[PDB]
Amino acid sequence: GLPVMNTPGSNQYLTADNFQSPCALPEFDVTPPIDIPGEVKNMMELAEIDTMIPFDLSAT
Amino acid sequence: GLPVMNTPGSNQYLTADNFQSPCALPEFDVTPPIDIPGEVKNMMELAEIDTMIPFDLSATKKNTMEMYRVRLSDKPHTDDPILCLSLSPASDPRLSHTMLGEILNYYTHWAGSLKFTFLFCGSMMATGKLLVSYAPPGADPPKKRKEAMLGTHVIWDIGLQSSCTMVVPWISNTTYTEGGYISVFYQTRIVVPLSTPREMDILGFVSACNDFSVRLLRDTTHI
Amino acid sequence: GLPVMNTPGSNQYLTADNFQSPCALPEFDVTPPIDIPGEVKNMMELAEIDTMIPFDLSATKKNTMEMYRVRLSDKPHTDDPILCLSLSPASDPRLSHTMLGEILNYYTHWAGSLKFTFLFCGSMMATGKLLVSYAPPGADPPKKRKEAMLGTHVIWDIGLQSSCTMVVPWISNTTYTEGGYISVFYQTRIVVPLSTPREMDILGFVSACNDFSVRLLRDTTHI
Amino acid sequence: RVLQLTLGNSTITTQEAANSVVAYGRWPEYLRDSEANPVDQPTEPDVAACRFYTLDTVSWTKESRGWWWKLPDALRDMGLFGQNMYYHYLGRSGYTVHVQCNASKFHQGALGVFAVPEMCLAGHTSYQNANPGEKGGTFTGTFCPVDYLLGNGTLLGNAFVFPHQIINLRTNNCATLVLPYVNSLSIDSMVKHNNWGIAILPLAPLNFASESSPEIPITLTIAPMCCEFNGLRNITLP
Amino acid sequence: RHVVQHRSRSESSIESFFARGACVTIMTVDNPASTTNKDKLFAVWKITYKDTVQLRRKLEFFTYSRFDMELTFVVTANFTETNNGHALNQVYQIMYVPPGAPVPEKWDDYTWQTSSNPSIFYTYGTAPARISVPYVGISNAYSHFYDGFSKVPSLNDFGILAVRVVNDHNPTKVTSKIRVYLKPKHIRVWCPRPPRAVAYY
Amino acid sequence: RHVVQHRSRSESSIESFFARGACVTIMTVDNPASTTNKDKLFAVWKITYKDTVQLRRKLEFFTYSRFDMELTFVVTANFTETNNGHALNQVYQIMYVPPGAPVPEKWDDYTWQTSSNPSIFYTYGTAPARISVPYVGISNAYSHFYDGFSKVPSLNDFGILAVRVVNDHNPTKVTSKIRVYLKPKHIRVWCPRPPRAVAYY
């Protein structure tokens, strides 16, 4: 068949991989999403919220 | 040659694989198909067929022909229902082994409507009225004819129409007693003209509607 | 490099593989072909050739030249057939080893028509009539000339035409006695002018038609 | 309304073809050109054999559990159809099974008439036993196959997946089933192989007023349709 | 739990219902060590759905069928003995005999060499083997029920799978098991029937 | 069983009839252990169809032929002894000597190094080796029958396959067998003949 040449980094699992993968439930039809209010698209959205400072961290 | 990088999931066999494969008989010319009548394209087509409910699963009626016949007779006016069928098509030993229920046992989630159809199999001369009540889910079934009438019901005149159909809408997966009830009460006792028998039988049939939906196959069939 | 995922069926050798392969003599320039006469493009071309049937496979005739000649003679008018050949071209020791049968032995399923052709090899002076009957499958062969005539038949006048052809249509695979029969009866006894011999020979040839079809090769040839 | 139907030399009366079922919504039809072959050769005698044949009536009682017939088996002694079914080697045919049933207005009960493809019964391993012919066999409530299982270990309530009709005496007292040729092959032996099987089981049992007729008649009238066979077709060359 | 669900019937299709890999047999072979070996040197299995109740039931929902057949062979061996087993990697011949063709009777039978019969040569340790047999039926559909007889005084052939080990004179006995995973493909069905119980399954 | 079949002759084509993999020899070699070794250190086989009756018969249906040749080598080794055999993975030289070229006579013969002769170097455990030899005939078709003589007072050369193991001083004797699977390709044939019996085959 097509001549190929396995390169280094073959058959390794890099946890930061981003490849395709075979689905285990291909015939399954997924429960479709609803428009739940309050969707976050970036964690900074949470840092942008004014939250109360605990000034007095004394022993008591 | 072409530089490639074997990824994880290589040389595994996932039973749910969908790849290509080399044919063992490539030169073979396959016997071509004919138009056999009765082709099924979806298993729900079989659940859409009205199949007879085995109401009376008693110790003696069960696994007989009498397990399908709800007998109406002449006896004191107790407003106990003729039948009270719970709408658990997957787990209810009556609806469980219907064709609908047989297909639903193969799946994990399902939703839609069920049309029930009671068929009167008495005399052409017999006359009377039955009350076919529907109790929605979360409501315990009605125990008396008044409770049934003040809810959702159909007064079925036997002398006028030999069958009564009722489409229940909120049927969904059990988990992984609720669903509602279809009950039948005597509104009136049955009136016969002469020595005509005062012992009739009503049959019952159930099916899914076209809307009905199943998903996540769960074949659990072993020995 | 290119991320790939080895699938099942990798590094196996399926004898029915059809892939590419590296040539061992890429720089070699192959001796170019000539137009040799007699190129065959399909084995059925060989089954389409009329080849002589070995009718008489007796203990003494078999594996001789006499196994191909059905002798006509002068003897009492018994309506027993001159020959009754069963149309099992794959399993019938007569038709089995014809070229047709030899090719059919290589396959598992086959269907089409067979043209049989009887050739009279007597005198130019000889005169008479034969009845070439065809019994379809499922019908036991005719035992008398009347039974043959009331069925499908050809009255072959020897003095007028030296051969008779008969195309049988419903020939198909045995499995994995049926098929029909071609029988020959004396309608009339053979008439000769003088001391001309009263012992003739008819030959027989069989072939597939252009329509004929085979499939699923089953080479079973060992020692 | 009373419709009188004639096929050949044979006439029947039908109250109305008001509810006449066609199995899988497919009408009987000859073998089409796309699935035929001029070298696998059929002929069409749908002239004379394709008529109404009316089996000997059966008697529904209170104790009756059911009846069954096989096709083309039941018609193997029925005139030209039975003749062709033995002369010819390969044959195909649809059917029109008109189950009439004669009852008063003071009888009550219901029959389920089921047309089954490849109705393999079981207590089976015997031709004469599995093919009772014109008279058919009968079911049981415990050879003869079981009522609620159809013989084939099969809850009768689900039987309504098959082409069927319900003869409920208070309403209609007759049923018609139009059966097309159904087989894995386009054409096949009729004597060795039954394609269809009729099964009539009382869903609701018979009952009647005091001194009515104790046993009512169920009559079957089977009409072959698009009956076609082999195939004597020889070419003689000059 | 009680969720609103839109119309969805894709997974109830015939393909989704049937085309699911499932083990249909577990063949076993022992290495051709001339120690005490019987029967053992080669395995044979006639392909059939009637030996696994799940597929059998799902099919017997219907009268007639057609389907291709994706076979996938998962081989698993190990040394039979406590013996310090050293063995060079074995090769397995996985022969598919088409319908109506002779079966192997010996390890050295002529059929193993026959060109007709497609064979996989599987090297142990590699990815599981796979072939796709097409619809090999004589008729125009696989018939699960056949009201009828062979002769006038049910069963359909999908083929045979034979397996042997090619390595000849092995010193250490290596037992091996080949799980056959069948997956029907391009399934068509006709004339639905009621399901059976789980009684005579 | 008696099924209506439309016209179909694809599988009776010359390619479909002939182009089918089939074992044509089983070469054997033992590892170059300087223990007792003869002959054994290398195998040689002159390519020929006349040693397998199936291919021979199918070809002798005809007078003349042309075809390429897809050879595929299935190697299978094992330790000859009960010895606790430890051996690093062996490499096999599978040399194809073209027609009319010298044959190896020793393991260390000069031919093994010759650039002319294409050689596969096959690592055991990997996928079976494969090469495709073209039509290497001197004439314009392989002649199965040749009415005629060499000198005035039948046989045609397809090449030779030689095999050896490259690993040199092995302690443990490893016997190995290389099944050669020939598959004719791009077959053309001329002047059909009657088949022989299975008598002198």
Side-chain angles (χ1 to χ4, degrees):
Chain A
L2 185 71
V4 301
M5 186 146 63
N6 291 320
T7 63
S10 309
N11 303 302
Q12 70 175 27
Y13 166 47
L14 173 63
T15 49
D17 271 335
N18 184 25
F19 301 131
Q20 306 186 40
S21 42
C23 200
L25 303 183
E27 292 159 336
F28 177 65
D29 185 55
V30 161
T31 307
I34 50 169
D35 199 352
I36 312 184
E39 197 185 357
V40 183
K41 302 289 186 180
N42 193 290
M43 298 301 293
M44 278 289 106
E45 294 188 21
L46 282 47
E48 287 188 43
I49 299 166
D50 287 308
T51 47
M52 209 154 56
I53 295 156
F55 287 104
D56 316 281
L57 305 183
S58 303
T60 73
Chain B
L2 185 71
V4 301
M5 186 146 63
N6 291 320
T7 63
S10 309
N11 303 302
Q12 70 175 27
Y13 166 47
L14 173 63
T15 49
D17 271 335
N18 184 25
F19 301 131
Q20 306 186 40
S21 42
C23 200
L25 303 183
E27 292 159 336
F28 177 65
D29 185 55
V30 161
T31 307
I34 50 169
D35 199 352
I36 312 184
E39 197 185 357
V40 183
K41 302 289 186 180
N42 193 290
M43 298 301 293
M44 278 289 106
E45 294 188 21
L46 282 47
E48 287 188 43
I49 299 166
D50 287 308
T51 47
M52 209 154 56
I53 295 156
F55 287 104
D56 316 281
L57 305 183
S58 303
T60 73
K61 279 74 176 176
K62 71 191 179 179
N63 303 136
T64 69
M65 282 296 309
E66 280 291 330
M67 77 188 186
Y68 287 110
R69 305 154 188 174
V70 189
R71 166 148 285 101
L72 312 182
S73 64
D74 277 32
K75 64 92 177 176
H77 279 217
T78 310
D79 292 339
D80 51 33
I82 289 151
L83 61 88
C84 180
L85 174 64
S86 191
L87 278 64
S88 294
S91 350
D92 180 14
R94 296 175 289 194
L95 297 185
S96 171
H97 298 301
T98 53
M99 199 76 190
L100 173 66
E102 284 292 356
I103 294 173
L104 268 60
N105 297 138
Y106 278 108
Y107 292 86
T108 296
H109 305 122
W110 36 263
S113 302
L114 308 185
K115 69 183 283 184
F116 294 76
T117 311
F118 297 93
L119 170 56
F120 188 76
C121 293
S123 296
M124 192 152 173
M125 301 279 102
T127 310
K129 291 179 186 304
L130 300 169
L131 197 154
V132 187
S133 202
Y134 161 65
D140 291 331
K143 304 295 173 64
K144 304 294 176 186
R145 186 217 66 87
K146 186 181 165 64
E147 306 188 4
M149 176 272 295
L150 296 170
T152 309
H153 70 306
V154 192
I155 292 165
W156 170 23
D157 194 353
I158 282 160
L160 300 182
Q161 63 181 19
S162 296
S163 70
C164 185
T165 316
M166 203 168 197
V167 181
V168 180
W170 268 102
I171 302 100
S172 178
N173 173 228
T174 183
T175 185
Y176 316 119
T177 316
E178 284 291 350
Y181 299 87
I182 291 278
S183 302
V184 193
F185 297 88
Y186 295 100
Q187 174 66 52
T188 73
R189 80 195 326 159
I190 305 295
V191 176
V192 304
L194 295 153
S195 61
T196 296
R198 295 182 194 187
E199 299 176 349
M200 286 69 77
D201 286 349
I202 63 178
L203 308 170
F205 306 87
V206 57
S207 85
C209 286
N210 192 50
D211 53 71
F212 200 100
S213 154
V214 304
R215 41 193 195 82
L216 190 61
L217 187 79
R218 187 171 55 198
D219 199 336
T220 311
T221 300
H222 57 109
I223 315 178
Chain C
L2 185 71
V4 301
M5 186 147 63
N6 291 320
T7 63
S10 309
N11 303 302
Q12 70 175 27
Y13 166 47
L14 173 63
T15 49
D17 271 335
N18 184 25
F19 301 130
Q20 306 186 40
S21 42
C23 200
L25 303 183
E27 292 159 336
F28 177 65
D29 185 55
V30 161
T31 307
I34 50 169
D35 199 352
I36 312 184
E39 197 185 357
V40 183
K41 302 289 186 180
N42 193 290
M43 298 301 293
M44 278 289 106
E45 294 188 21
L46 282 47
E48 287 188 43
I49 299 166
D50 287 308
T51 47
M52 209 154 56
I53 295 156
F55 287 104
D56 316 281
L57 305 183
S58 303
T60 73
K61 279 74 176 176
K62 71 191 179 179
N63 303 136
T64 69
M65 282 296 309
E66 280 291 330
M67 77 188 186
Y68 287 110
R69 305 154 188 174
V70 189
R71 166 148 285 101
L72 312 182
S73 64
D74 277 32
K75 64 92 177 176
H77 279 217
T78 310
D79 292 339
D80 51 33
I82 289 151
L83 61 88
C84 180
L85 174 64
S86 191
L87 278 64
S88 294
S91 350
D92 180 14
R94 296 175 289 194
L95 297 185
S96 171
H97 298 301
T98 53
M99 199 76 190
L100 173 66
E102 284 292 356
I103 294 173
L104 268 60
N105 297 138
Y106 278 108
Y107 292 86
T108 296
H109 305 122
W110 36 263
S113 302
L114 308 185
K115 69 183 283 184
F116 294 76
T117 311
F118 297 93
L119 170 56
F120 188 76
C121 293
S123 296
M124 192 152 173
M125 301 279 102
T127 310
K129 291 179 186 304
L130 300 169
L131 197 154
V132 187
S133 202
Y134 161 65
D140 291 331
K143 304 295 173 64
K144 304 294 176 186
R145 186 217 66 87
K146 186 181 165 64
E147 306 188 4
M149 176 272 295
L150 296 170
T152 309
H153 70 306
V154 192
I155 292 165
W156 170 23
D157 194 353
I158 282 160
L160 300 182
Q161 63 181 19
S162 296
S163 70
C164 185
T165 316
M166 203 168 197
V167 181
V168 180
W170 268 102
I171 302 100
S172 178
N173 173 228
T174 183
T175 185
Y176 316 119
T177 316
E178 284 291 350
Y181 299 87
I182 291 278
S183 302
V184 193
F185 297 88
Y186 295 100
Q187 174 66 52
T188 73
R189 80 195 326 159
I190 305 295
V191 176
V192 304
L194 295 153
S195 61
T196 296
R198 295 182 194 187
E199 299 176 349
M200 286 69 77
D201 286 349
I202 63 178
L203 308 170
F205 306 87
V206 57
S207 85
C209 286
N210 192 50
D211 53 71
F212 200 100
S213 154
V214 304
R215 41 193 195 82
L216 190 61
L217 187 79
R218 187 171 55 198
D219 199 336
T220 311
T221 300
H222 57 109
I223 315 178
Chain D
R1 302 177 191 177
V2 56
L3 277 296
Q4 190 189 243
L5 314 174
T6 299
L7 287 175
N9 57 343
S10 118
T11 306
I12 71 170
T13 315
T14 303
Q15 59 188 16
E16 201 70 18
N19 52 354
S20 120
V21 167
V22 192
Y24 316 117
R26 279 281 289 279
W27 202 267
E29 58 190 326
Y30 300 102
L31 181 49
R32 62 188 75 179
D33 290 342
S34 44
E35 295 170 347
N37 187 234
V39 176
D40 282 13
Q41 288 165 353
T43 185
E44 307 181 348
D46 172 44
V47 171
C50 274
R51 80 199 271 277
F52 297 114
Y53 302 101
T54 305
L55 317 181
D56 291 333
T57 307
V58 297
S59 64
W60 183 13
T61 76
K62 294 193 198 298
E63 302 82 38
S64 296
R65 315 303 300 174
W67 310 265
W68 49 276
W69 295 265
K70 304 289 189 71
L71 299 171
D73 165 50
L75 311 189
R76 73 188 169 195
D77 292 307
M78 291 304 189
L80 292 176
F81 190 81
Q83 304 297 355
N84 300 342
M85 181 172 160
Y86 277 97
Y87 275 68
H88 305 274
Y89 180 56
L90 303 180
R92 62 176 277 147
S93 176
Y95 309 90
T96 316
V97 190
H98 190 196
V99 174
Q100 302 205 31
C101 182
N102 271 315
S104 74
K105 296 180 170 55
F106 294 85
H107 293 83
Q108 65 187 19
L111 302 158
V113 180
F114 307 105
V116 181
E118 307 296 340
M119 198 170 77
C120 305
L121 298 166
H124 172 80
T125 182
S126 165
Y127 176 89
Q128 190 272 352
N129 208 17
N131 290 3
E134 177 178 3
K135 65 180 182 298
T138 61
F139 290 102
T140 60
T142 295
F143 87 111
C144 287
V146 168
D147 47 4
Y148 67 99
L149 296 176
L150 284 157
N152 43 0
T154 300
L155 299 181
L156 179 72
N158 302 344
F160 299 86
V161 297
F162 292 123
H164 74 278
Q165 278 207 45
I166 300 166
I167 293 171
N168 181 21
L169 295 177
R170 58 173 291 121
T171 181
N172 66 338
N173 69 340
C174 76
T176 304
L177 294 183
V178 189
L179 308 178
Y181 181 71
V182 175
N183 197 12
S184 51
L185 304 160
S186 292
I187 194 166
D188 197 352
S189 164
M190 286 192 147
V191 181
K192 296 176 188 174
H193 166 64
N194 288 320
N195 311 283
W196 282 108
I198 308 305
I200 304 178
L201 295 101
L203 309 171
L206 183 69
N207 199 357
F208 44 84
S210 172
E211 47 190 309
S212 313
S213 301
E215 58 190 30
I216 73 159
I218 309 172
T219 288
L220 275 79
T221 295
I222 309 157
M225 299 184 67
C226 297
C227 49
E228 62 184 336
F229 311 82
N230 77 342
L232 271 293
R233 216 167 82 145
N234 205 300
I235 297 90
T236 48
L237 307 176
Chain E
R1 61 181 69 268
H2 203 178
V3 65
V4 179
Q5 184 57 38
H6 291 263
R7 185 183 184 180
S8 177
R9 285 191 167 189
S10 65
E11 198 162 9
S12 60
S13 73
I14 302 306
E15 202 71 5
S16 301
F17 187 67
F18 283 105
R20 309 185 89 97
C23 184
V24 289
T25 178
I26 308 185
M27 310 169 73
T28 75
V29 298
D30 292 13
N31 221 350
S34 68
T35 309
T36 61
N37 293 16
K38 277 74 69 178
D39 294 355
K40 216 68 66 168
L41 299 187
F42 77 102
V44 171
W45 177 65
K46 189 177 191 294
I47 301 169
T48 180
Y49 56 79
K50 285 192 175 194
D51 55 350
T52 59
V53 299
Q54 286 195 359
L55 178 57
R56 191 181 183 180
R57 197 168 189 279
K58 292 166 80 187
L59 283 169
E60 291 184 1
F61 270 94
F62 301 89
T63 307
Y64 307 114
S65 186
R66 279 180 75 96
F67 56 88
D68 307 337
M69 199 158 56
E70 175 192 291
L71 311 169
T72 313
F73 307 90
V74 177
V75 186
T76 42
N78 57 6
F79 301 102
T80 303
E81 295 292 327
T82 315
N83 183 231
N84 291 48
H86 309 80
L88 304 177
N89 206 71
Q90 293 168 210
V91 184
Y92 292 82
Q93 186 165 359
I94 292 150
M95 185 161 67
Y96 164 74
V97 183
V103 184
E105 295 292 327
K106 310 290 182 187
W107 184 89
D108 58 348
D109 187 73
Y110 76 96
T111 49
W112 297 102
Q113 312 292 352
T114 301
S115 58
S116 305
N117 303 343
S119 311
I120 307 163
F121 280 99
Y122 165 81
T123 304
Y124 190 80
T126 55
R130 177 169 290 170
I131 44 167
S132 181
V133 181
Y135 171 74
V136 296
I138 63 184
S139 314
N140 307 74
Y142 296 134
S143 179
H144 316 138
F145 306 94
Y146 174 82
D147 181 20
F149 301 83
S150 292
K151 302 171 177 182
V152 62
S154 281
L155 189 149
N156 43 3
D157 195 3
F158 305 103
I160 296 99
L161 288 165
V163 180
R164 63 172 182 175
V165 171
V166 178
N167 305 52
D168 302 326
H169 294 81
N170 307 264
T172 67
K173 185 179 173 185
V174 172
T175 306
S176 173
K177 303 217 185 177
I178 304 91
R179 294 174 166 71
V180 180
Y181 265 86
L182 198 152
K183 177 164 193 167
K185 291 178 74 62
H186 306 82
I187 308 101
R188 304 177 63 186
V189 288
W190 297 267
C191 302
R193 313 172 77 82
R196 302 298 195 267
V198 194
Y200 61 98
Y201 279 167
Chain F
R1 61 181 69 268
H2 203 178
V3 65
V4 179
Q5 184 57 38
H6 291 263
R7 185 183 184 180
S8 177
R9 285 191 167 189
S10 65
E11 198 162 9
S12 60
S13 73
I14 302 306
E15 202 71 5
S16 301
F17 187 67
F18 283 105
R20 309 185 89 97
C23 184
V24 289
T25 178
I26 308 185
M27 310 169 73
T28 75
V29 298
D30 292 13
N31 221 350
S34 68
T35 309
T36 61
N37 293 16
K38 277 74 69 178
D39 294 356
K40 216 68 66 168
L41 299 187
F42 77 102
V44 171
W45 177 65
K46 189 177 191 294
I47 301 169
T48 180
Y49 56 79
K50 285 192 175 194
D51 55 350
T52 59
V53 299
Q54 286 195 359
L55 178 57
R56 191 181 183 180
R57 197 168 189 279
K58 292 166 80 187
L59 283 169
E60 291 184 1
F61 270 94
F62 301 89
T63 307
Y64 307 114
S65 186
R66 279 180 75 96
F67 56 88
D68 307 337
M69 199 158 56
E70 175 192 291
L71 311 169
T72 313
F73 307 90
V74 177
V75 186
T76 42
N78 57 6
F79 301 102
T80 303
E81 295 292 327
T82 315
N83 183 231
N84 291 48
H86 309 80
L88 304 177
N89 206 71
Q90 293 168 210
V91 184
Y92 292 82
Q93 186 165 359
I94 292 150
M95 185 161 67
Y96 164 74
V97 183
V103 184
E105 295 292 327
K106 310 290 182 187
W107 184 89
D108 58 348
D109 187 73
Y110 76 96
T111 49
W112 297 102
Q113 312 292 352
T114 301
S115 58
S116 305
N117 303 343
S119 311
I120 307 163
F121 280 99
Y122 165 81
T123 304
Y124 190 80
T126 55
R130 177 169 290 170
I131 44 167
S132 181
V133 181
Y135 171 74
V136 296
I138 63 184
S139 314
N140 307 74
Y142 296 134
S143 179
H144 316 138
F145 306 94
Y146 174 82
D147 181 20
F149 301 83
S150 292
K151 302 171 177 182
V152 62
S154 281
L155 189 149
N156 43 3
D157 195 3
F158 305 102
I160 296 99
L161 288 165
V163 180
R164 63 172 182 175
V165 171
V166 178
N167 306 52
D168 302 326
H169 294 81
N170 307 264
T172 67
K173 185 179 173 185
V174 172
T175 306
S176 173
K177 303 217 185 177
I178 304 91
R179 294 174 166 71
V180 180
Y181 265 86
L182 198 152
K183 177 164 193 167
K185 291 178 74 62
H186 306 82
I187 308 101
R188 304 177 63 186
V189 288
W190 297 267
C191 302
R193 313 172 77 82
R196 302 298 195 267
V198 194
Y200 61 98
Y201 279 167

